[PDB]
Subunit: 205 residues, 5 copies
């Protein structure tokens, strides 16, 4: 009951008893992105759309979510609804339908102020699967990034350029030949723009 | 009218929980009742199930003495009025579609019974389904964000309840099991728990 | 004309008193009887590849609460009113063998009468478990679906019908399917999960290609 | 000067919004008109046809009247359809929930009249047999209040001719005729009349 | 150092105060006495699908919307030199720009967030998937098919909302190189029409010419 009271007090202190309005040029934020590809579900050659199921790991850190575990019964982290906090507007740049969310929208917040949010998603995106019924397979790509924040407000990075394939569905209609995730910088507008480019080579299993 | 006043007062009292923690872990019991394998798509390797899920847990903070409330021992309430566990399928390919009202039953000892009916599309190769051996598929269910140190999953039985399986389904069930699994990941010492639903079926 | 302004005032006041100055659902001590009746409009689709059939129908629901009673004389002789279904408690009447979420085809509005009775008539499209084998034959196909509370046993919600005959007077005359018979029967239903039975109304439809 | 016109509008909306629907004592008339844009498809396997149209709805409330001279000569304003009461006009033989294609915003005028024009895609019960013949196919669907009788809400049309001037010239289907006709229905049980507008469309493969 | 940390806190406080002063200290939409000009431009990303059985074609594009309100102006010097901010599109008035011949509800593909600048100008760029009325007959030809769809306010006439374009050329620099359909031309043109009614009505007409492969 004390642990419960401690956690409710912590969330009340963080969410009620102090003010974050999003990143700014004077208060920029770095968001780390990683993809865990679970399934290429469908590849449509009549419309050049491919459907992926993946987990999108998002990580950032805010001073305003920091606390001393000693003041709160040594609580070092908690889970909370993603709507309780600010989250980055990371968006697929060439989707062809609204993303469908497959998991609870809940984030893990740690006492250092770091946040980890890992929504599972089904995404339809622009992809010509020509060659998927061949040895070399097909190659397609999709960029992810902020919709409204330039690189002066949100910077992106990956922890690795190799997409996590350890959850890829063993009996998918498609096998993965390779999957990479790479930070890109592009420069109308003075400010740089950042994305992570997800590149997937695949073929019929 | 006195019973109505008592129930309204109980609910006000109770509803005026941050989730479990390592220090205050919660056990959630899970069971499945499979009603129908509706569809098996060999072009996408997606299979569609209709089932309902029994979910049960207990909170001291939902406890009350009936004698203080007209001998009310339980009530029904919107699932939005209370914390519910984030039990999720780990290999769905579409958002789950809910077939039953989001209402749970709370009992005076603090226990909660929630029974969501769902249609689920999940990753499944139906190869063999037109053969004597049939096809076999599996989908894990568990917390999305809590480890086995915060939410422990249990089952009452490893037999999926098939007593309400639709007798004229396109697919007959050869077997269906629900098995608690303890999973570890090389990075971390803490256990993760899921219930693995394994279904063997054929046309 | 001042009469009209007065009637509006009486109704806003009645609604304010009933909703703002005052139902937690039925209990064992205070159980509720819901009357159900179906009006079947159309069998839209019968899918033999998945054994799902799609129905369009109106489901009439009626119940009565003391907490919704008023004296018409205290409120300018208002004897009933329409209100959003979200303003009041409604029963969780659920198809027990749907294969998709029901789709609502009519406004979520109910009629409340001064004796505390409520009438609510949702139009729905429902996909449910049904093997249409035989539909291209003279005998046709037969399927059934139960409707009842999801969370309330017979000790909290009872159901009744006014008739066991489904109303076919609005059935679509150029449907792909003709109705041979449609019945609606109250059942006391025992589930191995639970010592207390649930009440359902069993909708049994015999139909064939027109 | 512009801040004044804005202040006037905001005050008017405030005055007006700071109505329980019609009653037999305070009944209401809704004028309905259809502008048919497209027959998108016809499914002979299910006898469902899909229409795209916008539906003009007009009614008048004393409680929405104001004097333009008291409010900077504001004669009308636009407002979210959620800020006001709107009639529960429903298709009686749809087979899927209507899909709304336009913003849910209405126009309120100083004489208390409200104009709301939802664009919709509708699937409804229709046998397209004959659509590939000179005579074409004929189908119909009634629209009316779901919960209000003719004692609370009357319906009417300005014309019985459906507006076809915006009908898609390259639709897969051409319209031979389209009418919208007020119908009154009485029943021996009940003393109250029931009103609908019957949309009748005759159409043919182009 | 501590000063850098304090600056960031100040910057956050300044933003919260700006948004507070703008929003909950104090737009009812345009009026005949206060007309608004919305600038529209399209960036066409993909013609996904052309259905000859229903004459519906599906587009993916993003639609840049821009307008300017006196009531959204502020002096940057009064707010730590903040010159613009991002905010939820639900925090502010937005124009009801609607496609006039869609056949399904538009599907939104991007975050509903806008950028507000100190001169009171607002920029909002929703990405959308749209199904609209279009006979793709000719798509399998050298000159391709031609389809058009008008965009404009649903409820405001040209008395209250005017439209303009910065160019009549649809932006094709992000068009999907491996689409099933190649673009032959794409234009966006302001029109004044009538429907009966004294008020003139304004739209922007998107005309696309495209063919297979
Ligand atoms: C159709 N049902 C499956 C019947 C009646 C409504 C729905 C849900 C009901 N129900 C109740 C329970 C239950 C209740 C209490 N404890 C364990 C299981 N499980 N399923 C049984
Ligand atoms: C595409 N429209 C049909 C144009 C512009 C937006 C939509 C709706 C508009 N509109 C206005 C009216 C109207 C307004 C006032 N009185 C009668 C009809 N009817 N349709 C005309």
């Amino acid at each position: 009951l004390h642990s419960q009271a401690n956690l409710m007090r912590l969330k009340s202190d963080l969410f009620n008893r102090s003010p974050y309005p999003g990143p700014t040029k004077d208060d920029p934020l770095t968001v780390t992105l990683g993809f865990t590809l679970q399934d290429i579900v469908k590849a449509d050659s009549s419309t050049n759309e491919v459907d992926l199921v993946y987990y999108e790991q998002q990580r950032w850190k805010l001073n305003s979510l920091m606390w001393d575990p000693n003041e709160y019964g040594n609580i070092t982290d908690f889970r909370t609804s993603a709507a309780d906090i600010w989250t980055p507007d990371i968006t697929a740049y060439s989707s062809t339908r609204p993303v469908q969310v497959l998991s609870p929208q809940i984030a893990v917040v740690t006492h250092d102020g770091s946040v980890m949010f890992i929504p599972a998603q089904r995404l339809s995106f622009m992809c010509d699967p020509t060659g998927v019924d061949s040895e070399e397979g097909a190659t397609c790509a999709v960029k992810f990034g902020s919709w409204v924040y330039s690189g002066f407000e949100i910077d992106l990075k990956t922890d690795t350029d190799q997409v996590d394939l350890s959850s890829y569905y063993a009996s998918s209609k498609y096998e993965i030949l390779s999957a990479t995730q790479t930070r890109q910088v592009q420069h109308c507008c003075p400010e740089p723009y950042i994305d992570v480019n997800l590149v997937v080579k695949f073929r019929e299993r």
